[PDB]
């Protein structure tokens, strides 16, 4: 049974590097192309890279071209994505997926995905001359608002749950 | 680049009702070699990857209920659900799989219209309770991740002394 497992996901410094890998099993690895596809916090899906079965052709969209390298090791049944010059907008769940080299039907097989979070160079520049006092006040402002946003989600969910619990 | 416009963005439904989703593409998705439209439709539920639902525009994947039908050609594509079930509440994405760069639509989300639950099976009601739990916890965790992201440069700036 076909199985894809991503790893490597982590917090990255502004402009930093990171390498993801994806362990393949339950099929003959060397006979299929592979891809990476990412999903951003807004839920949009974006194709990141594709590799041929033999490793000799690679493809990238303009958004990551020059920065991202897709590779594979057919002996180790492992797909790789090496990322450079990462920016906050590269924050996403990264999925590896099989390329259907025979059927050509899109992505039938996806792994569970690995989270990559990239720190903003811009956000860092913005705080350059803030004092500890300035920063503490800003910091302390967040959690009270997070709590209220969470409370909205919970209340809405329970309002959908309660009518069902009442029927049962 | 080929752009895919999915409408509506969300759609409130009642169980049993027919639903219709639209994917319009800026360019043709005809694979000239074999005359099939390489458009794929996916279904995504909270905590999991998109699931392939329909390929070559109109061919149902194995194990997909026949209440899902894909259709259209050229630029205008539709996904129809003849009789929608609470288990079909999800985000639906179309994808250009014909030419680089591969591109996805922005998604059409199906939601339940807010009594009438008397006409549902106890099975379908328990299934909805089970689906609500990971949906709410993912929404909550996405809020925690967003606020980690807002906190991070401030904690980085405090530490950098």
């Amino acid at each position: 049974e076909v199985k894809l497992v991503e790893s490597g996901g982590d917090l990255v410094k502004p402009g930093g590097s990171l390498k993801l890998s994806c362990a393949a099993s339950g099929f003959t690895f060397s006979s299929y192309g592979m891809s990476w596809v990412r999903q951003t916090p807004d839920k949009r899906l974006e194709w990141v890279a594709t590799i041929s079965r033999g490793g000799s052709y690679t493809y990238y969209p303009d958004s990551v071209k020059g920065r991202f390298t897709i590779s594979r090791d057919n002996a180790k049944n492992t797909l790789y994505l090496q990322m450079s010059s990462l920016k906050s907008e590269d924050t996403a769940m990264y999925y590896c997926a099989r390329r259907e080299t025979y059927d050509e039907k899109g992505f039938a097989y996806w792994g569970q995905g690995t989270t990559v979070t990239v720190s903003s160079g811009s956000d860092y520049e913005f705080l350059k001359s803030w004092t500890v006092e300035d920063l503490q006040k800003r910091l302390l402002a967040l959690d009270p608002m997070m709590e209220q946003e969470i409370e909205e989600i919970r209340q809405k969910c329970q309002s959908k749950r309660q009518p069902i619990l009442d029927a049962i | 680049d080929i752009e895919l416009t999915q409408s509506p963005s969300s759609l409130t439904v009642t169980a049993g009702e027919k639903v219709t989703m639209s994917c319009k593409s800026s360019q043709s998705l005809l694979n000239s070699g074999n005359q099939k439209n390489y458009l794929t439709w996916y279904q995504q539920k909270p905590g999991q990857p998109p699931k392939l639902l329909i390929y070559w525009a109109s061919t149902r994947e194995s194990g997909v209920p026949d209440r899902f039908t894909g259709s259209g050609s050229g630029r205008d594509f539709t996904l129809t659900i003849s009789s929608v079930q609470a288990e079909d509440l999800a985000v639906y994405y179309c994808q250009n799989d014909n030419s680089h760069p591969l591109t996805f639509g922005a998604g059409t989300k199906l939601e339940l219209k807010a009594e009438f639950l008397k006409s549902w099976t106890v099975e379908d009601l328990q299934k909805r309770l089970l689906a609500l739990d990971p949906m709410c916890e993912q929404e909550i965790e996405e809020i925690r991740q967003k606020y980690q992201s807002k906190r991070q440069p401030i904690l980085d700036a405090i530490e950098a002394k």
Binding site: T50, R53, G54, Y57, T101, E104 | -
Partner: peptide, 9 residues
């Protein structure tokens, strides 16, 4: 295989 296979897209 004697040849690699390009992506179909």
């Amino acid at each position: 295989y004697p040849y690699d296979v390009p992506d179909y897209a």
